[PDB]
Amino acid sequence: MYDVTEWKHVFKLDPNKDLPDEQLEILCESGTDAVIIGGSDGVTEDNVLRMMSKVRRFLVPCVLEVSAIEAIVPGFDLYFIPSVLNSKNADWIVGMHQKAMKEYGELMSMEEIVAEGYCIANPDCKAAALTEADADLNMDDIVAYARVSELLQLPIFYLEYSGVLGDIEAVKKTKAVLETSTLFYGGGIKDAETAKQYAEHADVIVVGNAVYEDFDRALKTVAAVKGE
């Protein structure tokens, strides 16, 4: 009974890192619209399983972003399955999902899945390297990828700048072309000011790295976009 078109803020947590249990409880009770567990590069199923067990008690939706088939774990409310639209490797577009349907077809059928169209626009991050993304893009290239996602009707279009602040103009123009898709933006949001700035254009802002860098400051990103 989830609806990402109602969301405004999500925290994305890296199971490859460690967060104190009190901080994890606080993020879950923060008012964020979802807590997303990033099942990515170097991720292990054991860490995803421990995380699931800790966040599932809260009312907030818990989501697993499936970046590696081996790290899939039952128990989450939603499963986000990325397709890296600007990847030069078919494995990151279709390949890996076909292997998953072939090997875990029954599991996939029992879960609530949401496809994400990713556009990785920071050429210097671990994700661009892993996925061989053609990540050095002009604004018109980004807008064209968003149009591809809007055509395929993927429910989410995720503009990913990882650790850097992306060009706000690119967020605005991407949002301009999206009619049916929900625009998720991630990239350098570390405090209330940046969160507000980007929440003016993105439908949902994603705060992740910041949680491990300056927790109190990152926490304020929720009130920044959902508060009075």
Residues in contact with Mg ion by CB under 5 A are 5, 46, 56, 203
- Residue-wise burial string across 29-66, b where 16 or more C-beta atoms lie within 10 A, e elsewhere: ebebbbbbbbbbeebeeebbeebbebbeeeebbbbbbb
* Residue 87 per-residue DSSP state: B
Neighbours of 207 (CB within 10 A): 28
Q: Is 107 in the site for its own copies (CB under 8 A)?
A: no
8 Å CB contact between 137 and 164 = no
Q: Taking contact as CB under 5 A, which single stretch among the options 2-10, 84-92, 174-182, 212-220 is the one that binds Cl ion?
A: 2-10
8 Å CB contact between 67 and 82 = yes
Question: What's the closest the beta carbon of residue 71 comes to Cl ion, in angstroms?
Answer: 6
Q: Is 24 in the site for Cl ion (CB under 5 A)?
A: yes
Partner from Cl ion, its own copies, Mg ion, none contacting 24, C-beta within 5 to 8 A by type:
Cl ion
Q: Taking contact as CB under 8 A, which single stretch among the options 97-105, 157-165, 167-175, 192-200 is the one that binds its own copies?
A: 97-105
Interface residue with its own copies among 71, 121, 127, 154 (CB under 8 A) is 154
Interface residue with its own copies among 49, 52, 68, 115 (CB under 8 A) is 115
40 is in an annotated binding site: yes
Give residues with Cβ within 8 angstroms of 207, minimum separation 6. 9, 10, 11, 12, 186, 189, 190, 195, 218, 221
Partner from Cl ion, Mg ion, its own copies, none contacting 178, C-beta within 5 to 8 A by type:
none
Rounded Cα distance between 158 and 84, Å, is 9
Interface residue with Cl ion among 2, 75, 113, 176 (CB under 5 A) is 2
Task: Quickly list H helices, 10-111.
Answer: 21-28, 45-55, 95-103, 105-110
31 is in an annotated binding site: no
Interface residue with its own copies among 4, 28, 85, 159 (CB under 8 A) is 85
* Residue 132 per-residue DSSP state: T
Q: Is 87 in the site for its own copies (CB under 8 A)?
A: yes
- Which residues are annotated binding-site positions? 12, 14, 40, 158-163, 188, 208-209
- Which residues are annotated binding-site positions for Mg(2+)? 14, 40
- Contacting positions for Cl ion (CB under 5 A): 2-3, 18-19, 24, 44-45, 58-59, 70, 163, 188, 208-209
